[PDB]
Every structure is written in C-alpha cells, then in structure tokens.
Amino acid sequence: VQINPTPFQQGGLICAMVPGDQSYGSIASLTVYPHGLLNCNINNVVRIKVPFIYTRGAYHFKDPQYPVWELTIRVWSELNIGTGTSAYTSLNVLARFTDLELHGLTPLS
Amino acid sequence: DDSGGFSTTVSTEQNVPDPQVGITTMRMDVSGVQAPVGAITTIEDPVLAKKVPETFPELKPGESRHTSDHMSIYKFMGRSHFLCTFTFNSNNKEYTFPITLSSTSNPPHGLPSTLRWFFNLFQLYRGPLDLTIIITGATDVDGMAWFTPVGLAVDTPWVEKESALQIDYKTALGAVRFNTRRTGNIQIRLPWYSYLYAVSGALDGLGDKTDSTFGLVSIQIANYNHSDEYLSFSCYLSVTEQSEFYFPRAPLNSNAMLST
Amino acid sequence: FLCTFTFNSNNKEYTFPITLSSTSNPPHGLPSTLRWFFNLFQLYRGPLDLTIIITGATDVDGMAWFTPVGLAVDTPWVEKESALQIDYKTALG
Amino acid sequence: EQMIQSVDRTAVTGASYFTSVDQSSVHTAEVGSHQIEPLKTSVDKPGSKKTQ
Amino acid sequence: EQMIQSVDRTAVTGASYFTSVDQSSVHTAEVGSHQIEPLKTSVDKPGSKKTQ
Amino acid sequence: MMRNETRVSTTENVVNLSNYEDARAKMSFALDQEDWKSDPSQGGGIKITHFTTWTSIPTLAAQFPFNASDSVGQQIKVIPVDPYFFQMTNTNPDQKCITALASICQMFCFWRGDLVFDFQVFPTKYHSGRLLFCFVPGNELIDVTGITLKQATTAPCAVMDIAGVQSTLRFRVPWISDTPYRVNRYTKEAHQKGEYTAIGKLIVYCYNRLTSPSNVAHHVRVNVYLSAINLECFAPLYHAMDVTTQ
Amino acid sequence: MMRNETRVSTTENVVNLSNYEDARAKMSFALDQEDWKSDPSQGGGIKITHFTTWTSIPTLAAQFPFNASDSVGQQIKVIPVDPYFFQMTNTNPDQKCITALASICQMFCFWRGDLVFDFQVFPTKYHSGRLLFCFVPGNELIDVTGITLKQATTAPCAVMDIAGVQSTLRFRVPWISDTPYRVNRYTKEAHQKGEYTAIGKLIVYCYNRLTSPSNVAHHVRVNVYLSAINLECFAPLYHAMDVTTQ
Amino acid sequence: MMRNETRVSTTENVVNLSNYEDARAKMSFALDQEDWKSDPSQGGGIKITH
C-alpha cells in the first residue's frame, strides 16, 4: 500500500487484511489481523504478506464459495491541516501472488 | 531471491499466536539502572514494536499460587457451557438441533452466551467436540439420539415434529439406546464428519449456511408420556484435545454477546 | 454441621455462604463445632470439604454451584427465585 | 551509549518487470508459510508453461 | 575524511520512579565531586531509614 | 466361584462440570473409535495453543487529543489502569468497540499482569512540547484530580517529547496492589472496601505547551493502545463488559 | 474389612452403537465359552478381508453406440464421473441394474479415489476412426455442452483409434475437487453451493468419422466399465441409489 | 467380547462420616483439578500441625 503525505498534514490510516466478513468483531480490535498502520510522521509505504485463509482445499474462480481475503481502510486518525496546506493525500493499493499453484484446466471461457 | 523481487520498508506478516506462557513464574531487578529503550519506539516498524517494554525500575513479581494453568484453552474450556434446551410434548416427537457456529445465529436458535463469544474469536476450526446433556423431568422414557453429518439427509432443525426418517437410516449411521432411569447422563464425542476440511465462525452468503456448520444431533423419543409430566433436555458443549485453532480474530462487541 | 434448608415451590433458588465470622450466630453462620474450631486461630488458607445429604422427596433435578468473592451471586440465606442466567451458571462450574 | 534501531529508508524493492523505488520503506509483514498437504483434494501436477 | 562528533538525541534518562524520555538530549555538566572532610563539624553517622 | 464386589460410594450420578477429566467422554459415536490427525496445510501453522495471543498485541483502548490552547499541568485524560478499559464504539455497524484484551480478562474473576500502555501520538515533525504520563497506584477511586502537577512529580512517571524520531511510548505499569490479584467487581453491582477493579489511575498531564506554526495543525491526537506482559487470570466466569464512560 | 467402592459416572445405561468395542458382547450362550476355528476347506481360500473386492474389478456402468452418420465433434454421451453412476435395468427379472462399485460407495457420505473408466468398443478390425474422452473437472453441474471441440482440446484428454490390436481404454480419472472428499448429496434432496456429487463430467466426442464398408456394420457400440484405484470412503449410512436417467 | 462384572455388596449408598478416607471428595469444581500450593509469606512460619 502506497500513500503520500506532505509533512504539514497530520493524521493516520489503517489497512487490514480481513478474511470472511466485516461482522460483529470490533473496529478497535483490528490489530489482531496482519495489518498496516499509516502515519503522517514516519513513513508512507508499507507492504503486507498474508497467507491463504480458506475452509476448503482450493479456490474456485468461476463460482467461489466466499472471498478468501478482503481489505478495508478505516480512518485511524483524522486529517488535520492548516491554512493553505493541501487538504488531501494520495492512496494506492498494489497486489501480487506468491507461491502460485494452478490446477483444473478448462476449455471454456 | 526466490521471486526475483526486493523489499525496502521493513513490514512483514504480523500477529503470530502464543507469545508467552501466562502462568506467573521466574524465567533481581528487571529495569532500573539502564535507561529505558523499550518505552519510546516506532510502532510503525514491527521489529521495533517487538522490543522488550519498560518504563520504571521493576523487579521479579514472583510465582503464582495455582499449578493449574487457567490461561490455556485445553483447561479453560474444559468447563462445559450452555448450547440449547428443549422439551417434549407428545408421543414419538422427533427433535432436531444443529451446531451452528455462525455469529448471525442469535440465541436460542444458534450459539448462546459463552459459545458465541468463544467460537467467534478465530476464523478456522477443526477437531471434535464434547457434548454433555442432562435428562430432567418425567422418568421411564426410552428415546434415541443420533448424529448426522453434512451432505446426508436429516429432519428440519429447531423443529419438534414427527420423524420422517426410517429406522434403517437411523441404525446404520450410529445412535445410542438408553432409558431415563438407568443412567440419566450423556457425555458424548461429536464426530468430525465432513468432506470439507475446516469450518468458520463468521461468513456471508451461501458460505455461511454451509461452511460454518459442521454437525447436527437429532433426537426422537418413545414411551413419552404417561401421566402428564414435562421432560426437559438441555445441551452443554465441552472441548477435547484433538482440536486446533487457526487465525486469531478480533473478538465480538458487547452487543452480540447475548446471554441466556 | 453447617446448615439445613428445605424447598417449598418450583425453581426456588437457595443461597448460603460460608461465613467464618464469630459474630454470625447459628443457624445464619457457623454452628456448634465450626464456630469453636474456626475461631481458634487468626489466619486461614486452603480448600475445604462439604458433605451434604438429600433427604425427602425423590426425583428432583436440581443444580449446585460455587461462586467466588467479587463475582455476583444471589442473596444469601434467602430462598427465592433465581435472577441469574444459566450462561452465568454453566460457565463458572 | 545504547543505540535504538530504526526503519530503512532507501532500497531497490520490486519485481524485475514491475520496479518502483520508494523513498520511505517499510518491512513487509509475513505470517504463516506455504503449508504442504498430505491430503491433496486434486491428484494432478501443478500447472506450468511446460504443460500448457 | 575526518568526522566531527555530534550530540546524542534519544536515550533512556531519568529515575526509576521519575522517568521522562526526551527527543533532544544534552550532556549534563558536573564539576567538582563529593569532597570528604578530615574535620567533620558533627560527630554522628549519616541519617538513614535504618536509624529512623 | 467369582468374587467381584464394590461398595456404592455417595454422591453417585451427579454431573461434574468444573474440570476437564470429569467433563470428558466415556463413549463416542465413532466406528472402531477412530482418531482424527493433524494437518498443517490449509492454515499454514497459525495455531493457538495458549490465550496470550489477544493480550500482548497492542489494541486501541482510548483516544484523546492534545490542544495547544491549554495551561501547563491541566489534566487531559486519566486512564483507570485495568485490562477492562475501553471507550470506543461504532455507528456503522452499531457495535460497542471492545479491546482484544478486554474480552480475555472479562471471562475471569481476578486479573494480574504488567500492563504496557502504548501512547501513539500523531504530530508533525515540528510540533514541539512534552507530556506527562503519571501513574498513581492504589484502587480505581481516589481523588487523584486534586493532586497538583508538582505534587504529581513526587510519584514516578515519564516525560515524552512530541517531536523526535519516534512517536509511541510503551508504559509498563507495575503490579502495585494491596491484594495479589484483583476481583471482577464489575460482575457484582456494589462497592465494598476490599473488592476493587483497578490497581491505580494514570493522568495524562499537560507538561509543556504545544509550539507549532500556523501551516500545521494546532492539536495532536493520541491513541491509547492496550497491551501487557506476564499476564495471569483465573477463576473463570462469563461477563460482558460495559463502556467506561469517563 | 473390605474396601471396594466406585463413583457412578453419568451417561449410565445408554446403549452405544457407533463403534465396535461398545457393540460387542460381554456375555454368550456358549457352554464353557467355546471358540469356533477356521477351516479353509469348502471355499478354497476365496476369503474377503477388505471391501476392495467389488471396487477395482470393472463393472458395466453405461452403454452407448457410435454411429457413422454423425458430425465430427458432436457430443455422444457425457459421463458424470462418480462411483454412483449406472443406467442399466432389466425386464426379466424386473431389476434396476446397479454396479458393484455403486453399492459399496452408497453406504457412505463421502467418496474419494482415482476412478478408472474402461471403454470397451466392439468394432470389426476394419472400422476406422477415433474418439475423444475429454474429462472436464469441477462439479456435477456446469454447462459443458457449450464447450466446443477445439475448446475441449484445451482440457487434458486422450484419443483412441477404433481399429488396432486392442479395444479397451482404461481412463484413470484424477482426483480434482475443491474439497478433499465429496458428500452423498443424493442422500439429501436439495442443491446447495458447497455440497456436490461428482468431481467432474466426461464428454465422449466424435473426434473422427467411422469409415467402414457395407458388408460390416455402420455402428460400433461402447460399453462403459466402472473401476477404480486407491479408493477411500468413510462416514457410513444406508442409501439406495436411483438411476441417473441422463 | 468384554467381560466386566462385580457383585453389589451390602451397606451400599450409606454416608460414612467417622474417618478421613471416607469423608474426602471423589469430585471437585476445580478446572483441570488444580492444586493450591504453600506460601509461608503473610504468616511468617507460625503454622499449626498438631
């Protein structure tokens, strides 16, 4: 995840890797997930490694049971500026696969 | 490199379980003389977040006063907690109740107080359980209790009705035979029978109604009843040692922890 | 001996403590041998044993539980209906 | 004199075909591993360009 | 290439009961010492909790 | 001639549910009593064998800002030092935000452990000044608001510059209590001298003013993470904790 | 003075019928408890100690001809790949023809194993042409009829010349399923995403035309034998399977 | 075939309260049957064993 603050802005963001559901689990308990914490003070690019979390053996693309992973962005601390300071920041989410396995070839699309 | 990439900012996989044993024992002052480097740190760096914390001159707290570790799951959930309760009313009524680990399933129809909090602490679940039920009420009733796996047919859950299933389907799969007068108690293993691997606690859609549930116990009675006295059963679930937990999850709110 | 009590109606919840105070005159407190013995010494630490006897009407399915200090429990020496839920009762023991 | 460690700043991180240099680095979190299965739900070899 | 030394920045300084972490440190000045007296104006032991 | 007899002991056919050896099973539905093995495949080795997982990881327990328009020594927010503390909620979804430590300890009577509070400020690099995190031990209820700032310099504490190269102070709370544990008095509904909830309180003071230009913000918000070390709890129960409304 | 007492445990006098050690006998009518030995005389050593007997032997599951008047790539017959498959019957006697593999696996919930289909054609030596046995994995229900012949060349498959010196192709089906087993959903009466019956389907295509003179037949019939290797089933039940009416 | 039987002796289900070995407990409320140790701290060794 790549964001970019100017250091006259303050605030914080959080990105969490959430499997299954955004159910009745707490927002203030989301540090138990493998997550990332963003700040307007120290750094602006973090990267997260997460495994395959799923009930069955493999994942079906043409008809999935449920999504394996899911990311959310909650406002971890509000964006406060002064006069003339930029009232925004940029945000990017990059993703790739690791240790890929492919099975079950199909002739159809 | 294995993938031919690189990494600059130190941030990796996080929240590996079991950091410490929770019984208090000795592994002199802990801090003091040396300046605390563990107080001020960078929480955005997870290597700097894993630093030994201190702020004050401290020393050894000592030992604890119970050898029984009250912070391991295998001796904490040994106490059996409530699942459901149900009463019979007429002759040969067949009752059916599942074990639905979904947090959407509000009690009574689903997980009550301790089971709804505990079995929504984690994502994946694999292993067998224990069930302790109590016969309460009218005596000399010869019933039968059986397990049915997923995929196979069984009667409608949370419904007291007549049985539409034959006895050859009931004797082939596995049940028990007992009277209320002989022993009056059941402490049973719940078999882990599924073609899927593990079950979840909180899902959505058709995955919630399929991949959260793992098993079901359904009961039909006979000789109930003579001269009118209610027979009440109540289900308490307990834990065994062959189950393992996976992916520690954020615990539920104070709102969905509903007690019965 | 410690105490004795009788039930009268349906689902009545009885509550009795173990009060080592010598101010607690019997029955509500320590009776004959327990009041002399457990006021022979100042400090007391360790577990006990309790032996009770079911006497009277048969085929009654009740439940007996312990509650530590600090945690909530019903009013002592009072036979009344239970105001405590079963999930509080099944979790403690 | 005890020095507190810090986070790295400049490093060549990225793929061989997908390369971006960051001025503010962070350690990538990684929990678990590629767990092998003694019970595989399929009995095939994994797919590759050699078989496609 | 000769490097000029600088002042320290982050350190755990403070008492065991009175602890404050500073982001800008400074070397504390100390001149003199605890000079012993061959002539003490009082003839007692120094006060302590053992005698109070 | 066979000789097999035993005496029927008392307390017979009474269901024992306090420990693990009596709440096990003597019977099973399993054909030939089969055993289900262990497969570390679909999880990857992320396995919980102990309850220390939801405890040592810092979880957000509270939130308070730090304005620049405050006097030096003004009390900002006290922290009743216990794992039971949390004040956040959510409107979407409607959920009272528990902490992951407040769910572990609420299923017990007593708690014990060296709590590590982590105060992550969110300044710029140029917001300057210092704060005071003064832990005052005892119980949950003393008049600690009447203790002055220089009177609070008598107690052990720590100072933290808002600027610098880090922004999170890990405050390891000592186990200072008259009792070797501390009962869940929240399970009960009555105050009583001898039963308590916390081992002390922790005032965030205004130790220095917030000096900053106008092109940055006038206030710096502080998150209150909740973590611990050497944590022990016993005497299990079931209780849902309520929001400490400060 | 004798000292013999035990505590009456709960779940007493309840009949346990799931395993073999509780469904045995403590008692017997046998005088002096006699044992009956083994005599391999009237059978000759043909002794069953395991259920693999009715499984690996190829049993006829289906029947389809191959006319010469068909276009190249026309779908002849799909095979829903499971041990539950059979379509034959009989009028004398009135009996629905089960396969010997369909009786073993129908007394279970789950099934697993590398099924070996054996397609015995019955040509002359001069009936020439080729067929395509294209297994498409997944579940029992996908639109595999819409997959074209050249689209079916993407999937792994095999070709077989009708002429030659042999006439039976043993098609070892791989275990390709999302789940490590596959439930007896035929025991239930409802479709649900997650429970299924088969690990895939297998279209017999018309890969080449049937070239033959007029003094031989214009069609070649193909029997579908049902066999397997490394077969495993568990979670027993009782179910009578119904004819898959294609 | 299992072979487990004993004869029911007389004086069964009568509470014996004269000695220590019959007035003990076969059961306990303790989770995992825990043991409480000895700590000679808050008394100082002033201990009555007779």
mmCIF file of C-alpha atoms in Angstrom, chain F residues 90-222:
data_model
loop_
_atom_site.group_PDB
_atom_site.id
_atom_site.type_symbol
_atom_site.label_atom_id
_atom_site.label_comp_id
_atom_site.label_asym_id
_atom_site.label_seq_id
_atom_site.Cartn_x
_atom_site.Cartn_y
_atom_site.Cartn_z
ATOM 1 C CA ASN F 90 -19.139 2.416 16.139
ATOM 2 C CA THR F 91 -22.263 3.637 14.362
ATOM 3 C CA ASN F 92 -21.730 1.623 11.156
ATOM 4 C CA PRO F 93 -22.006 -1.150 12.290
ATOM 5 C CA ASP F 94 -23.765 -0.472 15.610
ATOM 6 C CA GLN F 95 -21.166 -2.081 17.867
ATOM 7 C CA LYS F 96 -19.515 -1.151 21.156
ATOM 8 C CA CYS F 97 -15.801 -1.465 20.398
ATOM 9 C CA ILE F 98 -14.229 -3.903 22.860
ATOM 10 C CA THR F 99 -10.482 -4.345 23.031
ATOM 11 C CA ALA F 100 -8.957 -7.770 22.434
ATOM 12 C CA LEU F 101 -7.558 -7.699 25.963
ATOM 13 C CA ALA F 102 -10.934 -6.718 27.457
ATOM 14 C CA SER F 103 -12.531 -9.900 26.093
ATOM 15 C CA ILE F 104 -9.921 -12.265 27.569
ATOM 16 C CA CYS F 105 -9.942 -10.938 31.138
ATOM 17 C CA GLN F 106 -13.733 -10.406 31.348
ATOM 18 C CA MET F 107 -14.260 -14.195 31.499
ATOM 19 C CA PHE F 108 -12.491 -14.334 34.866
ATOM 20 C CA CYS F 109 -12.759 -13.060 38.414
ATOM 21 C CA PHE F 110 -9.176 -11.989 39.039
ATOM 22 C CA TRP F 111 -6.531 -10.422 36.816
ATOM 23 C CA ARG F 112 -2.807 -9.799 37.235
ATOM 24 C CA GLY F 113 -0.069 -8.612 34.928
ATOM 25 C CA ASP F 114 2.295 -5.790 33.991
ATOM 26 C CA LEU F 115 0.183 -3.743 31.584
ATOM 27 C CA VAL F 116 2.035 -1.931 28.788
ATOM 28 C CA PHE F 117 0.209 1.188 27.603
ATOM 29 C CA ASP F 118 1.347 2.425 24.192
ATOM 30 C CA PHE F 119 0.605 6.108 23.534
ATOM 31 C CA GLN F 120 0.992 6.772 19.816
ATOM 32 C CA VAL F 121 0.845 10.491 19.174
ATOM 33 C CA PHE F 122 0.237 11.744 15.634
ATOM 34 C CA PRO F 123 2.161 15.028 15.286
ATOM 35 C CA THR F 124 4.159 16.569 12.511
ATOM 36 C CA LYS F 125 7.938 16.642 12.992
ATOM 37 C CA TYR F 126 7.717 20.253 14.217
ATOM 38 C CA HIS F 127 5.001 20.035 16.892
ATOM 39 C CA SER F 128 7.133 20.518 19.984
ATOM 40 C CA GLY F 129 6.435 20.190 23.675
ATOM 41 C CA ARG F 130 6.223 17.392 26.206
ATOM 42 C CA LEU F 131 3.582 15.369 28.044
ATOM 43 C CA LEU F 132 3.430 13.647 31.428
ATOM 44 C CA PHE F 133 2.100 10.113 31.953
ATOM 45 C CA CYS F 134 1.861 9.885 35.740
ATOM 46 C CA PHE F 135 0.568 6.577 37.086
ATOM 47 C CA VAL F 136 -0.811 6.877 40.623
ATOM 48 C CA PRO F 137 -1.374 3.438 42.209
ATOM 49 C CA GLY F 138 -3.976 2.121 44.612
ATOM 50 C CA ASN F 139 -7.591 1.457 43.651
ATOM 51 C CA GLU F 140 -9.951 2.792 40.994
ATOM 52 C CA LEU F 141 -11.287 5.538 43.297
ATOM 53 C CA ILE F 142 -9.069 8.167 44.922
ATOM 54 C CA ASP F 143 -9.211 11.931 44.483
ATOM 55 C CA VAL F 144 -6.300 11.993 42.026
ATOM 56 C CA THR F 145 -7.776 15.064 40.294
ATOM 57 C CA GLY F 146 -6.854 17.123 43.361
ATOM 58 C CA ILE F 147 -3.176 16.156 43.097
ATOM 59 C CA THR F 148 -1.252 19.125 41.698
ATOM 60 C CA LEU F 149 1.365 18.885 38.925
ATOM 61 C CA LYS F 150 4.338 19.446 41.239
ATOM 62 C CA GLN F 151 2.625 17.103 43.680
ATOM 63 C CA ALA F 152 2.495 14.620 40.789
ATOM 64 C CA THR F 153 6.276 14.992 40.413
ATOM 65 C CA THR F 154 6.576 13.056 43.684
ATOM 66 C CA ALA F 155 5.126 9.943 42.037
ATOM 67 C CA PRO F 156 7.231 8.020 39.489
ATOM 68 C CA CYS F 157 6.367 8.944 35.904
ATOM 69 C CA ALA F 158 7.878 9.688 32.500
ATOM 70 C CA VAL F 159 8.142 12.553 30.020
ATOM 71 C CA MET F 160 7.986 12.345 26.223
ATOM 72 C CA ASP F 161 8.933 14.932 23.628
ATOM 73 C CA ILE F 162 6.238 15.207 20.960
ATOM 74 C CA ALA F 163 8.845 15.741 18.245
ATOM 75 C CA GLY F 164 11.747 13.380 17.621
ATOM 76 C CA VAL F 165 12.239 10.257 15.533
ATOM 77 C CA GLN F 166 9.612 8.082 17.274
ATOM 78 C CA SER F 167 6.033 8.701 18.395
ATOM 79 C CA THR F 168 4.949 5.802 20.666
ATOM 80 C CA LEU F 169 5.781 5.389 24.360
ATOM 81 C CA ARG F 170 5.394 1.923 25.899
ATOM 82 C CA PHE F 171 4.436 2.457 29.543
ATOM 83 C CA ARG F 172 4.966 -0.771 31.540
ATOM 84 C CA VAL F 173 2.633 -0.484 34.536
ATOM 85 C CA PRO F 174 3.962 -2.099 37.745
ATOM 86 C CA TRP F 175 1.824 -4.564 39.682
ATOM 87 C CA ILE F 176 1.100 -2.311 42.669
ATOM 88 C CA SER F 177 -1.867 -3.636 44.637
ATOM 89 C CA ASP F 178 -2.629 -4.479 48.259
ATOM 90 C CA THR F 179 -4.103 -7.854 47.103
ATOM 91 C CA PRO F 180 -2.059 -10.232 44.893
ATOM 92 C CA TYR F 181 -4.923 -10.194 42.350
ATOM 93 C CA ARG F 182 -7.962 -8.005 41.660
ATOM 94 C CA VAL F 183 -11.556 -9.240 41.513
ATOM 95 C CA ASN F 184 -14.059 -8.604 38.714
ATOM 96 C CA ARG F 185 -16.164 -6.237 40.788
ATOM 97 C CA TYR F 186 -17.946 -5.288 37.540
ATOM 98 C CA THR F 187 -19.625 -8.708 37.804
ATOM 99 C CA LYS F 188 -21.059 -7.516 41.115
ATOM 100 C CA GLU F 189 -23.147 -4.359 41.477
ATOM 101 C CA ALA F 190 -21.956 -2.930 44.808
ATOM 102 C CA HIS F 191 -18.931 -1.071 46.114
ATOM 103 C CA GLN F 192 -17.198 -2.627 49.115
ATOM 104 C CA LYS F 193 -13.913 -1.753 50.813
ATOM 105 C CA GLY F 194 -11.692 -4.729 49.959
ATOM 106 C CA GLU F 195 -13.023 -5.570 46.496
ATOM 107 C CA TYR F 196 -11.934 -3.276 43.667
ATOM 108 C CA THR F 197 -11.411 -3.125 39.896
ATOM 109 C CA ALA F 198 -8.101 -1.365 39.145
ATOM 110 C CA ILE F 199 -4.627 -1.178 40.666
ATOM 111 C CA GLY F 200 -4.444 2.575 40.047
ATOM 112 C CA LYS F 201 -5.106 5.514 37.729
ATOM 113 C CA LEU F 202 -2.962 7.341 35.192
ATOM 114 C CA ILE F 203 -3.424 11.076 34.499
ATOM 115 C CA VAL F 204 -2.158 12.498 31.228
ATOM 116 C CA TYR F 205 -0.924 15.954 32.248
ATOM 117 C CA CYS F 206 -0.046 18.969 30.138
ATOM 118 C CA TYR F 207 3.667 19.010 30.955
ATOM 119 C CA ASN F 208 4.649 21.583 28.295
ATOM 120 C CA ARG F 209 2.842 23.688 25.716
ATOM 121 C CA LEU F 210 2.422 22.760 22.047
ATOM 122 C CA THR F 211 4.577 25.089 19.928
ATOM 123 C CA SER F 212 3.747 24.895 16.228
ATOM 124 C CA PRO F 213 3.383 27.188 13.194
ATOM 125 C CA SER F 214 0.044 28.012 11.565
ATOM 126 C CA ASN F 215 0.595 25.898 8.434
ATOM 127 C CA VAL F 216 0.355 22.772 10.607
ATOM 128 C CA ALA F 217 -2.383 21.730 12.985
ATOM 129 C CA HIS F 218 -2.974 23.186 16.449
ATOM 130 C CA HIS F 219 -3.629 19.810 18.074
ATOM 131 C CA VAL F 220 -2.049 16.358 18.193
ATOM 132 C CA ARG F 221 -4.244 13.308 18.819
ATOM 133 C CA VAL F 222 -3.020 10.435 20.992
#
